[PDB]
């Protein structure tokens with residue numbers, strides 16, 4: 001079941017679907033040290049990210065190989081966008097989970113180096129647009145489909161998924177110099193989104209040593225689930 005029928009109708013059925021498959025709020029707390037708590041939380045975010053992707057209409061239409069290639073290239077973007085998303089109502093704070101909210105200094109003390117600052121930069125870029133939840137899920141799905149993995153074997157198939165999600169965003173906006181410009185403004189945050197994800201990976205790999213090899217960790221979980 002590839003859920004392709006959701007691309008046929010008015011977009012509101014697709015949006016309703018994205019809203020439903022949005023992961024449940026996680027609780028990071030039960031007493032572990034900050035680093036350990038975040039590590040445990042991270043493992044759960046990885047699994048949730050993978051299950052989320054598989055429920056994105058049209059994703060399953062891609063060859064198994066391309067699904068994995070797409071996921072390996074943007075999983076951090078999806079994850080990071082979730083963090084930014086939970087942080088929007090706050091000021092200069094990061095809601096890693098319902099019950100785990102850190103300011104810049106708290107992030108630094110939790111082993112995140114300067115990621116606190118980098119993540120808040122992303123958060124501020126999104127807060128400036130005052131996202132609604134519908135825009136976030138559409139943008140997130142689009143970020144998944146806008147992967148630029150070097151290992152994609154059917155590039156037009158990925159192109160078509162990306163196009164369909166972009167058109168969904170447009171149709172959603174149109175139905176709330178085209179003022180539906182609203183869509184472009186969301187798209188213009190995608191470069192910072194990708195950069196932020198790269199920054200997170202660089203921090204855990206060290207600079208490129210491999211202290212905390214998240215790509216391997218992700219792959220192992222990916223192939224265990226797919």
Ligand SMILES: COc1cc(C[C@H]2SC(=O)NC2=O)ccc1Oc1ccc(C#N)cc1C(F)(F)F
Nearest residue numbers: 035038039041042045083096110111112200212
């Ligand atoms: C210090 O924070 C992390 C620790 C780990 C585990 C590592 S660190 C090491 O020394 N040993 C390992 O196993 C993994 C990832 C962490 O960062 C996050 C945790 C949770 C979320 C969410 N929601 C986002 C992040 C980020 F990656 F966006 F920073």
